[PDB]
Amino acid sequence: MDKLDMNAKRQLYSLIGYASLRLHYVTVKKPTAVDPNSIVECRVGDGTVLGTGVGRNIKIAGIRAAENALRDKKMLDFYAKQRAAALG
């Protein structure tokens, strides 16, 4: 079900996540007092956030972060030409 941005995460992994790019999401929100919402940062296997986006919860923020990564048509094309070209 919806919780870890299935479609969004599947999109990134299906468009750029080939292997070396361990598509992972690290939430730093921790709702309390200083944290106003659910902020997540999609980090690759190496060590670079490709998708950063906030949300109401881990589900929303997760979809927002992945969506932020999908927005980069240029960055998506570079990987899309590798992930899609690496497999078929």
> 46: which 2 tokens?
């190496």
Domains of the chain, start order: 1-88 (3.30.160.20)
Helix (H, G, I), strand (E, B) or coil at 77: helix
Taking only Cα atoms into account, the Rg of the chain, rounded to an integer number of angstroms, comes to 13
Obtained via which technique? NMR
Are 45 and 20 in contact by the 8 Å Cβ rule? The answer is: yes
Render the chain in DSSP notation, one character per residue.
Answer: --SS-HHHHHHHHHHT-SSSS--EEEE----SSS--SEEEEEE-SSS-EEEEEEESSHHHHHHHHHHHHHH-HHHHHHHHHHHHHHH-
Are 43 and 25 in contact by the 8 Å Cβ rule? The answer is: yes
Burial of 52 (0-12, 13-18, 19+ CB in 10 A): middle
Alpha-carbon distance of 83 to 1, in angstroms, equals: 25
Helix (H, G, I), strand (E, B) or coil at 21: coil
